[PDB]
Design a protein around this ligand. Structure first.
Ligand SMILES: [Mg+2]
Ligand SMILES: [Mg+2]
Lengths: 256, 256
């Protein structure tokens, strides 16, 4: 009754916590008078990447730091010089954030045993994905199919990439597929394609914690922070939420 | 609440009764010792076209006729020689069966006035369609989009061509679209894509009558034959049925 499950990438099967991007931002400011925390790097949710770099420029404290190092406030020339460098570094460190999130390759092991096809979508461009897919593959993870915002007319809020997975995998009543993701947009994409949509919490971007940070942290503070992310997913489309991929099989059963 | 309507071609907007194919079959046997009625030409529902030609060969009466003309029963060589000719003639006469079914261009006139996008699918190949689309266009009918079994991994029972119309037209909750067709397979395709599916009766293939034959015929015999086709559509997926395109607007309203 459920022939396919389509997974998201970073924050769902690869790059726990989703740090690759934050790493580049921190790097770029570091090469000069950095002083930037990964907490500041997650705030920027502007439209374009350049807008992100600009946002950090604007951020008081960071601005002040730049001034104490250069005796001047950041310039358009400066913003332009840094952004220009973002993509170079990104390609350089992606291989380091392409390892299965653990529990993953094991459920993908199953599911595939009981005849379920596995597809996927992403916000990453085709280029980026060639690199990521190869490292991830050469490490225990490789989906039956893959689609990017380049292979269709639009980005992710839209269902175009999901319909592609459908055709290529040969599964059709859309409600015979499940969408799993780590962010609010993942929920929307799924609801827009008429699929059962499930959101994962531990390891998501919505959570923001590191594999290591979660390890520690006050057990009562975690269960509070998890409860917040779960509420956001639901309020945005999720049909079901789960803490680790290891509850997926169970959810399927429920659906039937 | 309903942004798009996607129409079928032959039997829905073009070629009333859907005769182009029957014409070729009749032609091919005519060139020799024909004696074939358009009623016999509609029976063959085999897998391949060659299988259709073979079926007529097999048909007693037709077989007998061939024997009285050639003193021999049809040959593999013969079946092969005729089929080989089918596609040539088909291209030759398609222009003659590409005129709007009347009432059509007028509802397409409307609908489009109230902002509804019009897409379409077909069983016809890309080639055939270049010819048909041009004649139909140059006569009052031209949809916003067009898709064929060539532009996707599979034929019509599947929803692949419908999803294509969706992406290109930019309409997404599938249940915001209506599927209109003239056959049982049209109903299936629609139900498989999660759309509201409506079947038209007067002018369909399921009915089998000619614009002229319907004109005449015993008014009480028609209403009986219509009732039969309507029952077949429903038993196969139709959400609503209509006698002429001129009831479509009304059905939309009902849906809302
Ligand atoms: Mg993600
Ligand atoms: Mg038809």
């Amino acid at each position: 009754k459920i022939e396919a499950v389509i997974f998201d990438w970073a924050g769902t099967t690869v790059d726990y916590g989703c740090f690759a991007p934050l790493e580049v931002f921190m790097e770029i400011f570091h090469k000069r008078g950095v002083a930037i925390t990964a907490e500041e790097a997650r705030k920027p949710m502007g439209l374009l990447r350049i807008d992100h770099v600009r946002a950090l420029t604007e951020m008081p404290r960071i601005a002040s730091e730049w001034n104490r190092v250069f005796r001047q406030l950041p310039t358009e020339a400066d913003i332009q010089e840094m952004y220009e460098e973002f993509e170079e570094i990104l390609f350089a460190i992606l291989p380091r954030y392409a390892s299965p999130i653990n529990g993953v390759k094991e459920v993908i092991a199953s599911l595939r045993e009981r005849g379920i096809k596995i597809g996927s979508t992403t916000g990453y461009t085709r280029e980026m994905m060639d690199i990521v897919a190869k490292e991830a593959a050469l490490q225990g993870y490789k989906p039956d199919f893959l689609v990017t915002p380049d292979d269709v007319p639009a980005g992710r809020p839209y269902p175009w990439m999901c319909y592609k997975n459908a055709m290529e995998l040969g599964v059709y009543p859309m409600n015979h597929m499940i969408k799993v993701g780590d962010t609010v947009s993942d929920m929307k994409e799924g609801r827009n394609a008429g699929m059962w949509t499930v959101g994962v919490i531990l390891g998501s971007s919505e959570l923001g914690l590191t594999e290591e940070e979660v390890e520690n942290m006050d057990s009562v503070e975690l269960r509070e922070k998890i409860e917040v992310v779960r509420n956001r997913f639901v309020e945005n489309g999720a049909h079901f939420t789960i803490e680790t991929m290891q509850e997926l099989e169970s959810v399927m059963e429920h659906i039937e």
